[PDB]
Design a protein around this ligand. Structure first.
Ligand SMILES: Cc1cc(/C=C/C#N)cc(C)c1Oc1ccnc(Nc2ccc(N3CCN(S(C)(=O)=O)CC3)c(C#N)c2)n1
Lengths: 412, 556
């Protein structure tokens, strides 16, 4: 692939100029080793002071792997890189990928390192290996091939990727294959025994066309909008009915015909919070009609590919986390819950970091893009620790919630 | 003659769309022209500059100044205009090391590389933008036109290209000599090692050998400075380090400029002098931009200043970094949102100290402030030493566990152990998770009139207890807090409180122990006195009894 694809920023935008955040010694040393070999293979080259651009870099360890991996936070360059229609007016996201029983995620980012980058564009991929205590000038590099995590890497490589997959797709027309950045999402509708064989048969086929040997198994069978559930009790206290009316009042924003008049009629008076109130006939009926309403999906929900996906997360305690994906408030396109985050029963940030990765993976499978997160964490805490538990080659966007939402109780 | 390697040229361009500078040359006195021509003729003999013809359409003004005892004129080229038009560079000298992150070096040499700076050539396609004109005597001949061939002093790209060119030259020497360290600062070069006085001198000669390969003569710095190195506001000693002398001035009339220069000294001194406080002195500068306004010191600002003179009475020093020893950081609460910390490896031998101030906000608590300080120390330590220190914090392990497990946000502090240094950070109250059996249930509500600012706050309870209080100069949100305060005031040690105020719940669920709102502070003082407080929320105007009865009582 001698010919480089002409890449340009968007009009009136300079290249990225993002500060490199501090790195630990072990991550600096790791990055030095990785970049020393990469420079020997011609993938990157030293640069001088006439390059003012910078993109942050750090080191992770992929899911259950002891080898250090280099990750480049290409988020700013991706927004400044022009909106890509490399081969056609756009790729139609496969709506059938979210309907398969099993989906395997392959990291095919090493195939990008075989096609060179536009010479005029390499200066925008500049990054700095920082030094401890600024005791030496930072090691400055720029990329010579397509870098992992860049928006243009799958776009420029799409013409070359579709030809590698054409004979495997020709023999398996029921297997869906989707690509997002450095990842290949390969799903089927069959028993895992033949699935790992197909997956192993896909990576060997990729190996003959020029890998990593790691996979990530998913099951989008159980991905929907989790229903609003009201309690079933035989004796209701005043406090129970108050939370019930409060939950129903909240659901009334989403659902029509939600009534609370007969349930509020139970609280006629100034009673103790622990006093048991018997349900009247008109109250159990109103509660019953509300159960029927909440059984049905939300009216007028639709995904708009022009708007942003918003992902909110609530900390529920005991390693449990709830979340909702939407574009308009009260029009949830997906809700869910997580429990017992692997290897973090004593670390809130590690659990939240793993939750963000899971929700992002689910959003990629369903809509083909990552959502913007509203994180229940202070900026300085998340900012300091999230890279220590990050294991995905992509990085989404996030903002910070500093006021406790009252709706945490309603997703409990 | 011995061949020398050419210093690789850095390609430089102007900002996109812009041309070169075309600034007119000022008229100069005859005695000034004679001094420039002499200087530039010498510079032309050294290859620094070169004569050019009139086809070059660019120009940068040149000026002649002198020193009072130095019996010579000096040559100044005002590159302010060319700098505005020159591209941006990777400014690699913005951050300096911190002395607490350095390793003790037995021997350290200083090499002058001032004559080395001129060996760095300038991009040939960029030299035409550095043209300048010496006016002729009486303006009767064409002015002498020159252009630079090397990095000009005062140009935008000179420091970055010089530092980068010297870094590239030293990279083979440093990478293959791992028992030494090299650092560049201005026209000086500092090489340190733990070798013997003999092997150290050899490496300096080996390094002088290596610089001759590109033809760089480097003698020792004129007047070899004895300990300590006065560098970037520090005192670098063979085994210790500290800041340059912090002397606080005595005065009976303090302007806001005096308080500004003050705080700068305490802030700079707070990195080695433990316990420095700067808030009560910073509160006297909340909002002002004129610098003579004599602001009288409060009794708290004097007490804070006098506490600083006591800390600054004797010089303290920081030790250098021993990577073989653990890194420990200890924090102390100091009051009014101030925190101090010490970072060390051996007890009482601090590497550095520092302070953290509470963020600006309406409500806060000690645990949040302690958490923020920990993150700042974490980030600072990773910058200086590349690792997170072990923390010793004044908070019980049981307190922190109860906090983060019940906190609505995700929070985390790295490895830490409790140190029994009062005042200890504690939780001042904890709301119940379920309603309390046998405890009186207080249904509260408030309401105000937007126009006249009149309002009412009160409650009704399950035992028939009632109260409604009229209020003046109040709002809806204020009467909602007042109603909760009345229920806390008038209830026993255990109480259930029912409110419809999403505003009040948002404040209390944030668990503050101190507030800028005097009314919130009063509510906090009431929660501390209680035993069990269960705060329940209901939506308003939905017919919830108790809530309905007291909503009508307070709404006119
Ligand atoms: C070598 C060096 C020089 C500089 C110079 C700046 C200036 N003016 C800066 C850096 C970052 C520097 O680099 C590093 C890197 C790691 N570790 C250290 N450690 C260290 C240990 C001891 C030192 N000396 C203290 C003062 N002298 S003396 C004759 O008594 O004044 C005794 C020895 C010095 C110095 N110098 C430095 N330096």
């Amino acid at each position: 692939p001698i010919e480089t694809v002409p890449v340009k920023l968007k009009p009136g935008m300079d290249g990225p100029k993002v500060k490199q955040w501090p790195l630990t010694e072990e991550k600096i040393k790791a990055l030095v080793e990785i970049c020393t070999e990469m420079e020997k293979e011609g993938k990157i080259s030293k640069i001088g002071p006439e390059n003012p651009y910078n993109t942050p870099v750090f080191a992770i360890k992929k899911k259950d792997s002891t080898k250090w991996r280099k990750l480049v936070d290409f988020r700013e360059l991706n927004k400044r890189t022009q909106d890509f229609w490399e081969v056609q007016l756009g790729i139609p996201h496969p709506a059938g990928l979210k309907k398969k029983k099993s989906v395997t995620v392959l990291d095919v980012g090493d195939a990008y390192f075989s096609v060179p980058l536009d010479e005029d564009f390499r200066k925008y991929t500049a990054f700095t290996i920082p030094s401890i205590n600024n005791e030496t000038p930072g090691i400055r590099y720029q990329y010579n091939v397509l870098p992992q995590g860049w928006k243009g890497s799958p776009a420029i490589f799409q013409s070359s990727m579709t030809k590698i997959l054409e004979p495997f797709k020709k023999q398996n027309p029921d297997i869906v294959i989707y690509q997002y950045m450095d990842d290949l999402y390969v799903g089927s509708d069959l028993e895992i025994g033949q699935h790992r064989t197909k997956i192993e048969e896909l990576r060997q086929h990729l190996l003959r066309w020029g890998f990593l040997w790691m996979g990530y198994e998913l099951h989008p069978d159980k991905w929907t909008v989790q229903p609003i559930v009201l309690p079933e009790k035989d004796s209701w206290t005043v406090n129970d009915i108050q939370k019930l009316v409060g939950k129903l009042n909240w659901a009334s924003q989403i659902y029509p015909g939600i009534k609370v008049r007969q349930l509020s009629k139970l609280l006629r008076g100034t009673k103790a919070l622990t006093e048991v109130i018997p349900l009247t006939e008109e109250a159990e009926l109103e509660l019953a009609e509300n159960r029927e309403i909440l059984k049905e999906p939300v009216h007028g929900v639709y995904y708009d590919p022009s708007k942003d996906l918003i992902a909110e997360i609530q900390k529920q305690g005991q390693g449990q986390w709830t979340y909702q994906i939407y574009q308009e408030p009260f029009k949830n396109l997906k809700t869910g819950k997580y429990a017992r985050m692997r290897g973090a029963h004593t670390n809130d940030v590690k659990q939240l970091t793993e939750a963000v990765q899971k929700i992002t993976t689910e959003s990629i499978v369903i809509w083909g893009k990552t959502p913007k997160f509203k994180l229940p964490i202070q900026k300085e805490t998340w900012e300091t620790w999230w890279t220590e538990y990050w294991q995905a080659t992509w990085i989404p966007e996030w903002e910070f919630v500093n006021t406790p939402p009252l709706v945490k109780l309603w997703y409990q | 003659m011995v061949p020398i390697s050419p210093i690789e040229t850095v390609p430089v361009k102007l900002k996109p769309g812009m041309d070169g500078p075309k600034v007119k040359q000022w008229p100069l006195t005859e005695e000034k022209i004679k001094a420039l021509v002499e200087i530039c003729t010498e510079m032309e003999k050294e290859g620094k500059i070169s004569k050019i013809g009139p086809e070059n359409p660019y120009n940068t003004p040149v000026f002649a100044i002198k020193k009072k005892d130095s019996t010579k004129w000096r040559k100044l080229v005002d590159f302010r205009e060319l700098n505005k038009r020159t591209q941006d560079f990777w400014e690699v000298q913005l951050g300096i090391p911190h002395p607490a992150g350095l390793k003790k070096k037995k021997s350290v040499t200083v090499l002058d590389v001032g004559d080395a700076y001129f060996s760095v050539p300038l991009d040939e396609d960029f030299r035409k933008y550095t043209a300048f004109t010496i006016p002729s005597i009486n303006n009767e001949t064409p002015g002498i036109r020159y252009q630079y061939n090397v990095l000009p002093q005062g140009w935008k790209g000179s420091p970055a290209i010089f530092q980068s060119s010297m870094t590239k030259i030293l990279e083979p020497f440093a990478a293959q000599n791992p028992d030494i360290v090299i650092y560049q600062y201005m026209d000086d070069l500092y090489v340190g090692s733990d070798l013997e006085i003999g092997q150290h001198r050899t490496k300096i000669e080996e390094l002088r050998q290596h610089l001759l390969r590109w033809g760089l003569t480097t003698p020792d710095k004129k007047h070899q400075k004895e300990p300590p190195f006065l560098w970037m506001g520090y005192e670098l000693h063979p085994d210790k380090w500290t800041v340059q002398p912090i002397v606080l001035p005595e005065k009976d009339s303090w302007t806001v400029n005096d308080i500004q220069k003050l705080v700068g000294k305490l802030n700079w001194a707070s990195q080695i002098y433990p316990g420095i406080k700067v808030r009560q002195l910073s509160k006297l500068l909340r909002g002002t931009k004129a610098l003579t306004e004599v602001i009288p010191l409060t009794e708290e600002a004097e007490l804070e200043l006098a506490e600083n003179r006591e800390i600054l009475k004797e010089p303290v020093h920081g030790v250098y970094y021993d990577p073989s020893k653990d890194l420990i950081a200890e924090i102390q609460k100091q009051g009014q949102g101030q925190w101090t910390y010490q970072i060390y490896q051996e007890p009482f031998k601090n590497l550095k100290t520092g302070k953290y101030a509470r963020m600006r906000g309406a409500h806060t608590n000690d645990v949040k402030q302690l958490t923020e300080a920990v993150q700042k120390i974490t980030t600072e330590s990773i910058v200086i030493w590349g690792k997170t220190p072990k923390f010793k914090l004044p908070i019980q392990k049981e307190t922190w566990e109860t906090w983060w497990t019940e906190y609505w946000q995700a929070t985390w502090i790295p490895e830490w152990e409790f140190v029994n240094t009062p005042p200890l950070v504690k939780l001042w109250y904890q709301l119940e998770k379920e309603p309390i059996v046998g405890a009186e249930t207080f249904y509260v509500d408030g309401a105000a009139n937007r126009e006249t600012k009149l309002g009412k706050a009160g409650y009704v309870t399950n035992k028939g207890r009632q109260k409604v209080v009229p209020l003046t100069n109040t709002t809806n949100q204020k009467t909602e807090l007042q109603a909760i305060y009345l229920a806390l005031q008038d209830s026993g040690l255990e109480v259930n409180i029912v409110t419809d105020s999403q505003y009040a719940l948002g404040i209390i669920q944030a668990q503050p122990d101190k507030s800028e709102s005097e009314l919130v502070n009063q509510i906090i003082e009431q929660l501390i006195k209680k035993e069990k407080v269960y705060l329940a929320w209901v939506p308003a105007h939905k017919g919830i009894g108790g809530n309905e009865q007291v909503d009508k009582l307070v709404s006119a």
